[PDB]
Amino acid sequence: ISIALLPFLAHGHISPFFELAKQLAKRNCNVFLCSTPINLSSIKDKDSSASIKLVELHLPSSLRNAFETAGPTFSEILKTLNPDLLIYDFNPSWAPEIASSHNIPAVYFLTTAAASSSIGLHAFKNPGEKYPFPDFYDNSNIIPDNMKLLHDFIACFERSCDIILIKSFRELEGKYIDLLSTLSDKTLVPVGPLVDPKTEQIINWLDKRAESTVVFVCFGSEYFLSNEELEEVAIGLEISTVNFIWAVRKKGILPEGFVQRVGDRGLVVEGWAPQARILGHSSTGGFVSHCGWSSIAESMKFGVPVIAMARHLDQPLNGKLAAEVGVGMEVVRDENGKYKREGIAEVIRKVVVEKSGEVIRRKARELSEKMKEKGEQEIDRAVEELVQICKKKKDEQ
Ligand SMILES: CC(C)=CCC[C@](C)(O)[C@H]1CC[C@]2(C)[C@@H]1[C@H](O)C[C@@H]1[C@@]3(C)CC[C@H](O[C@@H]4O[C@H](CO)[C@@H](O)[C@H](O)[C@H]4O)C(C)(C)[C@@H]3CC[C@]12C
């Protein structure tokens, strides 16, 4: 009934843990605890009445080496609370270790895709064998943090007790979920997806547009596109003849005359854009994204098709995944054709306004409704399986 969540020391991993807290606290009255430094706790000081937030402290020298030393603080926190279960992230390293010290079961929480992880663990469990689904990875042609990254992944997959929580749903990759289950010898439990004055202009502009006609573009923080990269997608949006809303992020670089040339038909935003509010709006019918996992989950929760412009890390593997189930399409690449006007305009026209992408549109809605039809019960089964894991540990000798 009482769970304690230790997310990693990164903002990209605090929001999933916080929304999981909100979702598990509103059902079965789960006495929730969430521990992380106050710097990462205070971002979620808004509508969090159901969960209980816990502080975590470290001391300086003379989060890098602090992470590697704040272990005892988490151990003291666990001894003070004595919770029935611990949910850890990717790189706490010692959190499973301490959970095994206080006789507390530790359940791993994967905030990434089953498909992506499946390639990696297949690689560990089957070094010689090839991927069971060659439509996703062809280990054939080319197989040329080092190993410290691999070991952390296989450890956080192995150290999980019985089950492994995942921020995913069956309707997107149940086959890869079952593959991961068979690979890790653990049961993969999907928890489904998970959910200032300047924002009224975006909504006011978006309300005046027709249904499923606006294309949202945002590529996330970090790896800030060069002006040469910006100009390609800018001209692709200009020649797409479709309404778009583009958000782009320390020297300031910008295309010359582009904002003037397009006049309206498009709104440029500097910082935080209403991603969820734009995707959920009925006027939106396209999302040009860098294929971040949380971004893909948000795009799929509202039935908005995906325009894949991945670049690094798991974003390609995520991207093509959206192209496998038929809810998205990728842009053609040259030597580095991720910045080309013709491919971007072609895919945008085909997905949003053309009939050839209707198969992508319908399947985007037919799946979205699915996510709202079987909703809430995924987390119910997750909670009851967590209760089963807690009650099976109740073993004296
Ligand atoms: C060829 C090799 C070596 C292995 C074969 C497997 C493979 C086909 O190739 C691909 C397929 C599976 C793969 C994508 C792998 C990559 O290798 C390594 C990634 C990685 C560990 C990298 C760090 C990432 O973690 C991010 O790290 C960023 C840095 O800060 C943050 O910005 C993000 O917030 C944070 O999520 C996260 C945990 C999401 C992923 C998890 C999945 C994994 C293993």
Residue numbers in the entry: 8 to 69, 90 to 171, 177 to 227, 236 to 289, 295 to 442
Sentences from the paper on this structure:
Pq3‐O‐UGT2, an important UDP‐dependent glycosyltransferase (UGT), catalyzes the production of Ginsenoside Rg3 and Rd by extending the glycan chain of Ginsenoside Rh2 and F2, respectively, with higher selectivity for F2. Pq3‐O‐UGT2 catalyzes glucose transfer from UDP‐Glucose (UDP‐Glc) to the C2‐OH of the C3‐glucose of Ginsenoside Rh2 and F2, respectively. In this study, we elucidated the crystal structures of both apo Pq3‐O‐UGT2 and its complexes with Ginsenoside Rh2 and F2, revealing the acceptor recognition mechanisms of Pq3‐O‐UGT2. The NTD contains a seven‐stranded parallel β‐sheet sandwiched by seven helices, while the CTD comprises a 6‐stranded parallel β‐sheet flanked by 6 helices.
Compared to the apo structure, the structure of Pq3‐O‐UGT2 with Rh2 was better resolved, particularly in the Nα5‐Nα6 and Cβ2‐Cβ3 loops, indicating reduced spatial conflict during crystal packing in the different space group. In the complex structure, the density of Rh2 is clearly observed in the NTD of Pq3‐O‐UGT2. However, the electron density of the alkyl tail is not well‐defined, likely due to its flexibility. In the complex structure, the NTD, particularly the Nα5, Nα6, and the Nα5‐Nα6 loop shift inward, with the most substantial movement occurring at the N‐terminus of Nα6 (≈5 Å). This indicates that Pq3‐O‐UGT2 undergoes conformational changes during substrate binding, and the binding of Rh2 induces a more compact conformation. In the complex structure of Pq3‐O‐UGT2, the His20 residue forms a hydrogen bond with the 2‐OH group of the C3‐glucose of Rh2, while Asp116 forms bidentate hydrogen bonds with His20. Thus, His20 and Asp116 are proposed to form a catalytic dyad that deprotonates the C2‐OH group of Rh2. By contrast, in Pq3‐O‐UGT2, Rh2 adopts a “lying” orientation (referred to as Nα5 orientation), with its tail extending toward the Nα5 helix. The Rh2‐binding pocket of Pq3‐O‐UGT2 is composed of His20, Phe15, Phe117, Asn118, Thr139, Ser143, Ile146, Gly147, Tyr164, Leu181, Phe185, Leu358, and Leu362. Surrounding the head of Rh2, Asn118 forms a hydrogen bond with the C6‐OH group of the glucose moiety, while Phe15 engages in hydrophobic interactions with the glucose ring.
